[PDB]
Design a protein around this ligand. Sequence first.
Ligand SMILES: [Zn+2]
Ligand SMILES: [Zn+2]
Ligand SMILES: [Zn+2]
Lengths: 218, 215
Amino acid sequence: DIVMTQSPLSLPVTPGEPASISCRVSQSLLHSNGYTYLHWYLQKPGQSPQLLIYKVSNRFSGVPDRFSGSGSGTDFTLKISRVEAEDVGVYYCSQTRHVPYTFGGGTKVEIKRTVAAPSVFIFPPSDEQLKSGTASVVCLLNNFYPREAKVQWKVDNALQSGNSQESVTEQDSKDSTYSLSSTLTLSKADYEKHKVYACEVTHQGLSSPVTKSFNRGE
Amino acid sequence: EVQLVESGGGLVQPGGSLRLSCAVSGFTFSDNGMAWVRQAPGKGLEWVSFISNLAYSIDYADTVTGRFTISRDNAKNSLYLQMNSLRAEDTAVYYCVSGTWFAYWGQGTLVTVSSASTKGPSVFPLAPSSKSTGTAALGCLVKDYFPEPVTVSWNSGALTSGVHTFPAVLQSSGLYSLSSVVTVPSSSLGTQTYICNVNHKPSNTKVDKKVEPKS
Ligand SMILES: [Zn+2]
Ligand SMILES: [Zn+2]
Ligand SMILES: [Zn+2]
């Protein structure tokens, strides 16, 4: 019955610079009590969520003075005066004022950083996987920034599509960099037939697209 | 020292039942309203249910109004959630949570609802590339297991630097697959030994795979 809309959807920030998020509600959250039951939360990667600000502006215990909570009526704001690498994660707003209890869809805070290019590695299928009857060819991009990147698979210079899938790490604690895998699935039968398997990587931190490959023998 | 511990989660078949419980320390259980909140994989937080300090009021989410029951035993300082007619979209991490302000959160327990069999993974070595950027890379491909989760360590937790264990991905087959990899010095290959330790609690399979360069 009562809808919470967060802005922006994603927010990358240079550490030390300020940050700002808004949460907008469908119906006024002011109540007869004189307290507005709107709260802010952080979920750090891999972790359970945790309370930051409660009842609009009050800082919960454990929580740095950097974090501020603000606003009234339909419109509310969370601020981080000086952003740290501690602050990476997803921030949600919520109300406990009337049933059903509703959360925002969340705002992912990312750390802005100097551009850095990926080291790239490529792995043939194991003999054990081939003995199974499947083949998968893995291409690793290590320690790079920013996230956006085109990894493209070639078998004897035939561009591939719909047969590769990627996963990405959470950006590193020390490094603030991402890493990424792309995994190409093919049949044993087809893998045996072809010679040269190639992972073409395009990235902002590369002057032009780069390639890592192998031939099945050695 | 506030603590909330959840139990009960695991793999269920659709239209099947599963009983979640949450035990508590560090504050007066019976002074506090409690809630459950869930998070579907890769999605936001979704509130499920709420129960008053003395069990006089209960509230539920629209999605679970028909099939979910929230109950508690203040004598045993425990909160419960009985989930009866389980669908695929109920699959989530279920968090036990304090009702005032949602201030204290349990670690969560994973509930998975589907008709797929529990299957153990196969672990294949991603043997280190011959060229030297002086960095080599190597890894472990953990393929064709269900359900989540799997954990990967290297040399029984002794090797941690350089390691990227990826988020799993759901293959077309409807099985999860995953790679964990580590970058090392090229010269270190002959002198150091690399074993990946893969534990899959649901299937109760644990495999240690030695990774070495191709013959
Ligand atoms: Zn072919
Ligand atoms: Zn009620
Ligand atoms: Zn790395």
